Amino acid sequence: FASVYAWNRKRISNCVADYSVIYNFAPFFAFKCYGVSPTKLNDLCFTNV
Amino acid sequence: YADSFVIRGNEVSQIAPGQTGNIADYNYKLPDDFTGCVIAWNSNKLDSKPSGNYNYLYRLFRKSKLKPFERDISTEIYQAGNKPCNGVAGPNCYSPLQ
């Protein structure tokens, strides 16, 4: 991926997504979650992520 | 109520309540109110061994979360992925023990 000088911003929309594919990765270190608790990122609909 | 354990200096700051860390994960949960205190001191001259203390273990990859003041001591069979690992399959075992 790119360095901090040029981030790769993406617009995720129109799809239906869950939290399992994010849990495919084990070495999670900076798992800090703000605003929304990690255990309940499911069953709630955003407007644009 | 006094408890004792041995952790690295990196994880020492994780004993604070209301935070997520390597220790504060599934492995160990502590009450967030935390009326008590925490006492720690360096013991690199005793616990450390020239041969390498690989006998110290910790379960990072436990499936479910933990409730404060709950014991996590069991076989801890690893069953993840989109298939029944059954503990014998082989791949994706990544056992929590380290």
Swiss-Prot record, chain A:
UniProt superkingdom:
Viruses
Q: What exactly does this protein do?
A: Attaches the virion to the cell membrane by interacting with host receptor, initiating the infection. The major receptor is host ACE2. When S2/S2' has been cleaved, binding to the receptor triggers direct fusion at the cell membrane. When S2/S2' has not been cleaved, binding to the receptor results in internalization of the virus by endocytosis using host TFRC and GRM2 and leading to fusion of the virion membrane with the host endosomal membrane. Alternatively, may use NRP1/NRP2 and integrin as entry receptors.
Assembly and interactions? Binds to host ACE2. RBD also interacts with the N-linked glycan on 'Asn-90' of ACE2. Cleavage of S generates a polybasic C-terminal sequence on S1 that binds to host Neuropilin-1 (NRP1) and Neuropilin-2 (NRP2) receptors. Interacts with host integrin alpha-5/beta-1 (ITGA5:ITGB1) and with ACE2 in complex with integrin alpha-5/beta-1 (ITGA5:ITGB1). May interact via cytoplasmic c-terminus with M protein. May interact (via N-terminus) with host bilirubin and biliverdin, thereby preventing antibody binding to the SARS-CoV-2 spike NTD via an allosteric mechanism.
What name does this protein carry? Spike protein S1
Q: Mind giving the lineage of the organism this protein is from?
A: Viruses, Riboviria, Orthornavirae, Pisuviricota, Pisoniviricetes
Task: Write the gene name.
Answer: S
